[PDB]
Design a protein around this ligand. Structure first.
Ligand code: HEM
Ligand SMILES: [K+]
Length: 294
């Protein structure tokens, strides 16, 4: 199968203003539906939907990725690794109804960008152009990562998405949002105290808390701290591996650096597999509701 090339195709006649309107709609709904997940809100689940819809990419044959918006098809929608994401998709439904012109891939990715920015995270430049592909282009289940593994697994896993050590540690920092839900993944608890504020607390907790390797009610091991935080074996591996550890310490001591590195890595993750023509518009940097006085 010759590796497909996915060329970004701007939605007919659309420009920055159109997308800022979609961003605003998402941002306004996030503010509105603040009760979700015990008042955590939909922010965290949207960032995941974005990561999971992009994380199926395989640099080897360009299969999967954000381009096709294939999560809308049952095979991917029902991936066990995607348990819980239906909530994010349901949240986006009204948005897509109001803006039927935006592709699914652009919507899924934009939802992640919007959530991060609205939760006070760094600005993440975003490019439009993803085009919906057929159901037969949906990647098989099993391309997303396991959480009961070590640093070697994490490092190898991320090489498929063309991510190096720094990108990996920066990306994992997204665990500063939301929490693990036993019913979804077999893990339970939040990584930090600000689960709807994007900050570098994940690195600080990892380094400063007193973790105990325990078993949860799903009979799975996870690191718990007296403060009520948890870390997956894969998160803990970042301080077990020497190379990862140096970067964890770096982000724990430099909020700005973490923001800048995360922004680059997250945008890259969301654009993997996409060929942007030279004449394509530059990446859009959307203003937050707060910056717009909305
Ligand atoms: C080796 C890598 C990773 C593993 C094994 C992993 C694993 C997990 C697990 C088990 C959950 C809990 C799901 C649930 O029960 O609801 C979760 C949630 C989440 N992850 Fe990751 N993750 C990884 C990488 C990332 C990356 C790269 C991002 C995004 C840049 C990210 C963002 C999130 C967010 C925001 C949540 C919270 C979702 C919510 O509160 O509903 N994760 N992750
Ligand atoms: K946080």
């Amino acid at each position: 199968t010759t590796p497909l090339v996915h060329v970004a195709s701007v939605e007919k006649g659309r420009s920055y203003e159109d997308f800022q309107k979609v961003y605003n709609a998402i941002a306004l709904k996030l503010r509105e539906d603040d009760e979700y997940d015990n008042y955590i809100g939909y922010g965290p689940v949207l960032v995941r939907l974005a990561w999971h819809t992009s994380g199926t990419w395989d640099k080897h044959d360009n299969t999967g990725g954000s381009y096709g918006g294939t999560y809308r098809f049952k095979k991917e929608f029902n991936d066990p690794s995607n348990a819980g994401l239906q909530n994010g998709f349901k949240f986006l439904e009204p948005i897509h109804k109001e803006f039927p012109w935006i592709s699914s891939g652009d919507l899924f990715s934009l939802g992640g960008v919007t959530a991060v920015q609205e939760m006070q995270g760094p600005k993440i430049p975003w490019r439009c152009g993803r085009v919906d592909t057929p159901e037969d282009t949906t990647p098989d289940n099993g391309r997303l990562p396991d959480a009961d593994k070590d640093a070697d697994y994490v490092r190898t896993f991320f090489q498929r998405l063309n991510m190096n050590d720094r990108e990996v540690v920066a990306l994992m920092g997204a665990h500063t949002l939301g929490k693990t839900h036993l019913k979804n993944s077999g893990y339970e608890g939040p990584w930090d105290a600000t689960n709807n504020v994007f900050d570098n607390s994940f690195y600080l907790n990892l380094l400063n808390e007193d973790w105990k390797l325990e078993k949860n009610d799903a009979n799975n091991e996870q690191w718990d701290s007296k403060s009520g935080y948890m870390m997956l074996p894969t998160d803990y591996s970042l301080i077990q591996d020497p190379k990862y550890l140096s970067i964890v310490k770096e982000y724990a001591n430099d909020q700005d650096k973490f923001f800048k590195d995360f922004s680059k890595a997250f945008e890259k993750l969301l654009e993997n597999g996409i060929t942007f023509p030279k004449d394509a518009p530059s990446p859009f940097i959307f203003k937050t509701l707060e910056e717009q006085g909305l």
